[PDB]
Design a protein around this ligand. Sequence first.
Ligand SMILES: *[C@@H]1O[C@H](CO)[C@@H](O[C@@H]2O[C@H](CO)[C@@H](O[C@@H]3O[C@H](CO)[C@@H](O)[C@H](O)[C@@H]3O)[C@H](O)[C@H]2NC(C)=O)[C@H](O)[C@H]1NC(C)=O
Ligand SMILES: *[C@@H]1O[C@H](CO)[C@@H](O[C@@H]2O[C@H](CO)[C@@H](O[C@@H]3O[C@H](CO)[C@@H](O)[C@H](O)[C@@H]3O)[C@H](O)[C@H]2NC(C)=O)[C@H](O)[C@H]1NC(C)=O
Ligand SMILES: *[C@@H]1O[C@H](CO)[C@@H](O[C@@H]2O[C@H](CO)[C@@H](O[C@@H]3O[C@H](CO)[C@@H](O)[C@H](O)[C@@H]3O)[C@H](O)[C@H]2NC(C)=O)[C@H](O)[C@H]1NC(C)=O
Lengths: 540, 540, 540
Amino acid sequence: TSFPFRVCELSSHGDLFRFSSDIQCPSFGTRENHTEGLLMVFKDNCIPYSFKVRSYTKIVTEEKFSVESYETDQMDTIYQCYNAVKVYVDRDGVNITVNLKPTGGLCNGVRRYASTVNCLITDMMAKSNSPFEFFVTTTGQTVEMSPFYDGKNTETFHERADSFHVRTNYKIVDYDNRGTNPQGERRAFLDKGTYTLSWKLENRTAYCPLQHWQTFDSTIATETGKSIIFVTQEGTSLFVTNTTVGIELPDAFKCIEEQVNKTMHEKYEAVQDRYTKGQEAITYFITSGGLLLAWLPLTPRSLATVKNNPATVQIQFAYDSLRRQINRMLGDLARAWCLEQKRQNMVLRELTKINPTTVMSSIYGKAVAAKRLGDVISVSQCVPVNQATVTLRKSMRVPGSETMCYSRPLVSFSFINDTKTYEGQLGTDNEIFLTKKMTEVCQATSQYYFQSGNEIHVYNDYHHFKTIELDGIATLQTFISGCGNTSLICNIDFASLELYSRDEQRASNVFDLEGIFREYNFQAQNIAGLRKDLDNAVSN
Amino acid sequence: TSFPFRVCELSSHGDLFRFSSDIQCPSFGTRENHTEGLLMVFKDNCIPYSFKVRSYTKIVTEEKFSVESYETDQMDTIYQCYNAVKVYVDRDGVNITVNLKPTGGLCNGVRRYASTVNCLITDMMAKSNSPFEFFVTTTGQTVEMSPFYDGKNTETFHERADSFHVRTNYKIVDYDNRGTNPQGERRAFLDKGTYTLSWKLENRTAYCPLQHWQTFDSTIATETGKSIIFVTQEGTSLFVTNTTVGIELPDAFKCIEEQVNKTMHEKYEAVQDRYTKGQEAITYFITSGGLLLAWLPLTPRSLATVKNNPATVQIQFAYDSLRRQINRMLGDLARAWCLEQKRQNMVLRELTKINPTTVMSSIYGKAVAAKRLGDVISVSQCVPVNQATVTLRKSMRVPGSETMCYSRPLVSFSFINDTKTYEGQLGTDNEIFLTKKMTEVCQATSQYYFQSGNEIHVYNDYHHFKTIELDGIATLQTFISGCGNTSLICNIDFASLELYSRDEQRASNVFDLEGIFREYNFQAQNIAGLRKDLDNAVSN
Amino acid sequence: TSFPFRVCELSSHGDLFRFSSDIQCPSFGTRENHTEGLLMVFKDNCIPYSFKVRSYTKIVTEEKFSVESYETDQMDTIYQCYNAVKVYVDRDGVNITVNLKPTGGLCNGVRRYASTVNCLITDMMAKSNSPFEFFVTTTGQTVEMSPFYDGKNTETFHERADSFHVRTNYKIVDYDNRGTNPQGERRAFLDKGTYTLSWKLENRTAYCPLQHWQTFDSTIATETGKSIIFVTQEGTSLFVTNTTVGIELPDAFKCIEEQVNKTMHEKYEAVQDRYTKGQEAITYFITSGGLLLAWLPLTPRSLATVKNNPATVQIQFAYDSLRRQINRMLGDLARAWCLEQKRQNMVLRELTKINPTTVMSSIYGKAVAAKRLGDVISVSQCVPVNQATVTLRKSMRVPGSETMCYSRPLVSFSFINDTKTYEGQLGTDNEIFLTKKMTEVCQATSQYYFQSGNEIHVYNDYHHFKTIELDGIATLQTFISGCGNTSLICNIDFASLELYSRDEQRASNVFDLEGIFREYNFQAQNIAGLRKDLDNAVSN
Ligand SMILES: *[C@@H]1O[C@H](CO)[C@@H](O[C@@H]2O[C@H](CO)[C@@H](O[C@@H]3O[C@H](CO)[C@@H](O)[C@H](O)[C@@H]3O)[C@H](O)[C@H]2NC(C)=O)[C@H](O)[C@H]1NC(C)=O
Ligand SMILES: *[C@@H]1O[C@H](CO)[C@@H](O[C@@H]2O[C@H](CO)[C@@H](O[C@@H]3O[C@H](CO)[C@@H](O)[C@H](O)[C@@H]3O)[C@H](O)[C@H]2NC(C)=O)[C@H](O)[C@H]1NC(C)=O
Ligand SMILES: *[C@@H]1O[C@H](CO)[C@@H](O[C@@H]2O[C@H](CO)[C@@H](O[C@@H]3O[C@H](CO)[C@@H](O)[C@H](O)[C@@H]3O)[C@H](O)[C@H]2NC(C)=O)[C@H](O)[C@H]1NC(C)=O
């Protein structure tokens, strides 16, 4: 499955996105003078430059400290360091050669080494996007420079110039290959006060700013005076061009010119029997969002020459009268689609307040850890756990609490290549939470169904009863079409009714957010009462 | 109204459904070679087998106990039982013949009888679905067998075989008809340790696995190599068939063969003037979701024979050129509909976390109690209350709390055929909650509008002011189209501004979930402070 | 920007709307006998009658009191009042002529004047809707009469008749123009016990009940026996008419007759070459929602006379066979649109529980303060603050709390024309909250991005780091199409993992509503434990 057992709440800081307010959907206005043509849509290119980075730090018990040049050489060559922080030493000892032992990193390709005072090394990935303004490490620390900054190149670099240096012919030793003496590299070093950071300088690579996105074989152009609106039959996509006369192609985009000549020729060749070219040269357009649109206008051949009114006039009139009706309908579909995207954006913005992790995982169709960092959402991979160790606990009653029960089953698991066993609670879709705070007052009778991939675990009275296939429980569609529409069963929790008849004040488990809201002001007044009573108890 | 006054939170466990992750929407790919034809869609049949069940239990003050065979005979014939639990007796008395009195059940057809130790009988419905793997009683107790299990039949039965027995020629007495001596039955008995359960064994009924769902009079079949995609013009429904050559009909489904011969002949007869049959026999297809699709391919007659280019060629070209364009548009509409259903499923999954009862009631268009039982939603009827007794309290200030007021109006009501009067708070759409915890700090001025079906109750200063028709308040659409778009009124709560200017720390009522979220961490730190201060007060 | 810095939570009571349950979408049923025609849709007219109102009150320390006729004359002419409340006087003094000083109102055109006992005047707007049943003042106080009630006119008036009077030739003085002696007016007075209210009686204006809404140039009418369903090609709008024979126009709507004659003639004149009129007179229809629909049926000219089968018959058959297919598709699009609106209404109803302010602001596309007043939503303008004074605080660590940090940046601001400086927290989209309760436990490392219009503020370690343009962070669409689809970075919060490995019980910041829900029952049990421990501490 694409949603394996995973811990997602450990994900600190990943790729950022924001919800676009003020999405604008055009009004077609005067809607005659449609013209057909090929549209190639080009999107800004993003290259995920992922590169291996070594982090060096001193941990002190908790203040942290960078590592100087002489000690980082000893770390990279011998994995030895010097037990002190510049002054106290571990166990209040004396400054001595202290040897780093290896330690598991939880991601693919992350390796930690850790020997009061503690030397620490972390091999880890960092990723950067096409503009190369910054790169984010697995720790979530962000560095405000290009990873290709050579120092002399004056490429984007906002950190302290004194903190950055580059050393040639640098030697680095692989921990289990200490005698192989690997080939030398050119390696950069950065001092951030909290930690030293080092990475290999790969001479910056070269790429073309625009990557091809879509080819729409027939599109309808509507000239609304200030803008051209392009309506695409494939999908329902709509493009608003802010200029009426197409711009000559900027030379930086000239890598496109071959691709457009090829795609236009290949696709026009399959269409020659139905259309003639309106222009000998492609017209280029730029959208406000920065998409480049390549437009080849085509004029349809009259049906007489496709390779009291007389028949031909009636046929051409009917054909043109229905083509225009289809074009109007496609335009209204594109406008409806634009408005629906505008409303989806708001719906997603609101659902992200309920749970960003699940919202994003549903958008992607794969497990992604999502964290709301104020007004931006960060998306990242979850921490994988090795699924052979994942075992649910058969009983979910809280040990040593006659009045408390777990509302989610306990899970025992181990991190990949980690011997230590950890315990947590099974969230939704094999998610594992490093918490045991999902508890509820033990009901006299309870039925709970928890889905763990292709199997559902059925718990009666907080004890594991059976495992059933997912097909044992109808999906929403099958439910509404099947016996979900029949006379629903009438249920009475007679125990709850008697309890309310005998103690109207009694507390009960909340089951939904709206119940939290309905209780909230009463609970806040209860807290205020606690505060006042405690202050009076202290005063007396 | 379909949303009468009701108590929904008493609903323990009803019909279960789950939100289907990984809904797959196909890509049409190579899109020529459309063919038209009739499509009959058949869906798996669900029969709601609802049957009357008698429950027997001993309640002890609270341990519960089943009832033996000799005492259940005395209950079913005389409604007498024996006051003891096998040992203590009610009022620490002595084992004696003790007579059950009748008691109201709150659902249609539920009747309770109840005389430390308490004999209890409950006539109640149980419902089961077409696979007959289990049946759920009104209490919410689920039994893991088919209600048609004859013991010897080896039909699905997972309970303890020692606990189940069947007795012939069993006699049962109706409480108010004790002299009528009803005809005998064959009745099954089950011991679940907590309770005995009994029901009449109706010889298992017979039915055909597939129920007809839809007939689509014209559909477009696209052969995408591995699958056939069926696009239906009525609605926007889409069906993905995992096989390219249609399977011969399984004999178990042969009940369909007459229905398909009839529907295909009846509907082709109205279409003969436009199409000819491509095949002499219907082709059957099965979807991954288990729908059976009956497909009659049709080939359209040329327009010449429907009962420099020459005219006929132009007419046929235009007709075929526009039919293909409509077919492409219908395919894109079906794909858009599939994606929109995929996104609706996520939206509903998230809104169910806000409030499943209201979400489900809106989906059904009728009052349904919905409870999230972990990862599955249970849907059931709400408990009806007799609407002649429902009276709102004219004042919603909390009695004996100068600083507290009710945020929802109080409701006095009686359960159907119950003399006892109960008091609660009016939730949304005539829902009644068995709680009075929806309270708020009394505002100096307040306006609240509560809708109770076709009338809105307007409360000024926590006192009932007037009742207005629902038409007195514009709907969202009428609002946005009417004066909602004008210059909105500018309001200043000057009292709130002065309060904040004079006590920046002062507490205020929360009005929405996002305000709960914004306060939550501060309230948690307040609770932690309470805990630390109380521990220090105890230590001193 | 349309979302300036603003305080929205001060908005007490504005225009009300409700979510329409039981939106009905028709079934087309028998679908032949389409007919084309022009449809004019007329909607009920709403006029926002906004008028200037003066409020008079005595504030007492806090009981409030109206002002008598002799003292209101002295307020309106000299802005003098008499320091007493009928008896105690400010500073326990003696009844004396006491002079009102001016004070800023926070809305455009609101002016307050305020000299134990405090005379108070408030010039403020009040707005009323077309039916003139009530008008709402800026304070949020609602008055149950028409503002055009002349006393003798017996126009809608539900307040106490003794409380209302009208005085001719009334003189009112402008505070800074005390010598100009403005022209007299006819002014009404109302005593509400809490406050006196006064406004100018402008003889009620006259208007026509129906305002033109839309003209749909081609629409499809389907006669479903009981109703006519109108499907409009522009947009996807659908109208259900409850009558099959159109009603003769009520005389009250006769103002429409000229507009319809003009629009029908102007639009038919552009269509004569394609259609002939089916009737010589427009047919009027009324929807259940009260829309008036003007219908001119048109019959299309045969293609022969638009100004073995023979060609003309084939051409007409093809044209009619495709027009019917387009009409069926438009009908299915209109039904899908109706169902989608029905589902949007539920989605919006649920999202309003998360945050009505943001939901409504997204619907309007402009900043609107929204407050849920039970089952109705009130919408109003937010209080503007003068944006030249808005300065974010560079540091968001809580002063004097080593363990607490602010989760939203602090904002210093001044109200328009107010010298006083106020401090609060920056909510979403330049919203300012008069609170400082959004706090969190200081994380060892934190990254937060807050958007403030066209700029994003980036805070590292609770200290302001940089400001970036909105284009520095990809929108959701650009994200999903760009590097958001690449291999996401794998992040480990190693500190969190160590903390959980060493103290499984440790508390953590909640980041979403579902985390509130997961913690809620455990926090409620913690509160209950606090209560029990405090009661035992008091008992001992
Ligand atoms: C603990 O013992 C280590 C043993 O290495 C001491 O490290 C030494 O630290 C000094 C500076 O305090 C280094 O001096 C350096 O010399 C190089 C030139 O070789 C120069 O480029 C540097 O800027 C610096 O002046 C020295 O190299 C370094 N290592 C050795 C081999 O002595 C460390 O200072 C002792 N102190 C603590 C904090 O316990
Ligand atoms: C309280 O008084 C009742 C009076 O009925 C006692 O019920 C009796 O219980 C015994 C078993 O303790 C029953 O014996 C049974 O005999 C039948 C055959 O007739 C056999 O099939 C059963 O397996 C069982 O051996 C007895 O029938 C039953 N009723 C009578 C009429 O005596 C009850 O035991 C007394 N005890 C308590 C718990 O207070
Ligand atoms: C404080 O001093 C003011 C000074 O104005 C007193 O106001 C006076 O109040 C009396 C009623 O208590 C007013 O009598 C009124 O006479 C008019 C006719 O001129 C009549 O229409 C009213 O119904 C009422 O009978 C009087 O006009 C008013 N002003 C003057 C100039 O004396 C006030 O009563 C003193 N008392 C308090 C509460 O401190």
